[PDB]
Amino acid sequence: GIGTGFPFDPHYVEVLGERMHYVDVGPRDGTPVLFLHGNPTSSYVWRNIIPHVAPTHRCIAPDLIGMGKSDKPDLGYFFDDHVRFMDAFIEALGLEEVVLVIHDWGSALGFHWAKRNPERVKGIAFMEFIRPIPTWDEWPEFARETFQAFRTTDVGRKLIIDQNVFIEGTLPMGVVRPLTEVEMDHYREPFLNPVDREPLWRFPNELPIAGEPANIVALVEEYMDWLHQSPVPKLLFWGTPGVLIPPAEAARLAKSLPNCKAVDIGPGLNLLQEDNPDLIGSEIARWLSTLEI
Ligand SMILES: CN(C)c1ccc2c(-c3cc(C(=O)NCCOCCOCCCCNS(C)(=O)=O)ccc3C(=O)O)c3ccc(=[N+](C)C)cc-3oc2c1
């Protein structure tokens, strides 16, 4: 059985006047491994992968601001808000050099931070990450109209804020195998009140699709350009058919990104962690030995 529980002790750090929650396990010395979750998850999405890395490496898994057990300030939760909070989280924890394990919107946070701090990143494991979607044709047909509806302030907010569709429908449709009730309740816990769902709606409205928003498209194209040239060790997980990263894209990236290892995880949509956590965790563990950390 795939683990459903969250046994990690809570850790907190005051950041920009707001308390943020993070998982911190593993030995204290050596290079830490920073796990960055996306939408609409939390450090809970790393629950079955950390146990493969925690025996030999420090594992830090924060909850993004307004998500998980972190505080819920009255912000718009634009990507720029998450950048400032994640920049200040990393400094508040005194992290010097790190290995990144990033997913979904956390990957945009990881890549944007690694582009600005390339000396402090010894490797990047990433899966179902954010890239420029040139046209709506590059978005999966089965989820296309709903995400077009998500990116509006009337129908989009009604679905996500008022009806919580992103948790009750979009999240299960990002996973191939079925999610138990206990797993669903963990993902529901930070969003029982419609107020807390603002990041669940701003995130898909920040997706770089068809040139909008222009600022996010430029930002993501920048770190994609850095990724195509930098020699930082890269580990990419992908599944079939995926959502953000289709198999043909993963094959292209596996040849064009320097020092990159691609790992097929089998069937998979967006939350690859939930469809094959053992392969992801045990491959990250094996890959960390090939780094000079
Ligand atoms: C439990 N079961 C499997 C479902 C499945 C679907 C639904 C749906 C549902 C969702 C969708 C839907 O979410 N489509 C789109 C998902 O496909 C995206 C998958 O990749 C994205 C992963 C996340 C990526 N994160 S990022 C980068 O974006 O930040 C479409 C139609 C329906 C429908 O019903 O007619 C419900 C709709 C309304 C509703 N009421 C008003 C309370 C309840 C719904 O309940 C559902 C339950």
From Swiss-Prot:
Pfam families per record: Abhydrolase_1 (PF00561)
> How does it associate, per the subunit comment?
Monomer.
Give the EC number(s) under which this enzyme is classified: 3.8.1.5
Q: Which residues form the AB hydrolase-1 domain?
A: 32-156
Family indicated by similarity: Belongs to the haloalkane dehalogenase family. Type 2 subfamily.
Q: What are the annotated disulfide bridges?
A: none
What does the record give under GO molecular function? haloalkane dehalogenase activity
What does the function comment of this entry state? Answer: Catalyzes hydrolytic cleavage of carbon-halogen bonds in halogenated aliphatic compounds, leading to the formation of the corresponding primary alcohols, halide ions and protons.
> Record's GO cellular component, any one?
membrane
Which reaction is catalysed here? 1-haloalkane + H2O = a halide anion + a primary alcohol + H(+)
| Matches recorded under InterPro entries | AB_hydrolase_1, AB_hydrolase_fold, AB_hydrolase_sf, Epox_hydrolase-like, Haloalkane_dehalogenase_2
Tell me yes or no: is Hydrolase among this UniProt entry's keywords. yes
Q: Which NCBIfam families match?
A: PRK03592.1
Q: Which pathway does it take part in?
A: Xenobiotic degradation; haloalkane degradation
GO biological process annotations for this chain's record?
Answer: response to toxic substance
Where do the catalytic residues lie? 104, 128, 270
Q: Does the keyword Hydrolase apply?
A: yes
Which ranges does the record mark as transmembrane?
none
Q: Which UniProt keywords apply?
A: Detoxification, Hydrolase
**Top class in the EC scheme:** hydrolase
Which protein are we looking at? Haloalkane dehalogenase
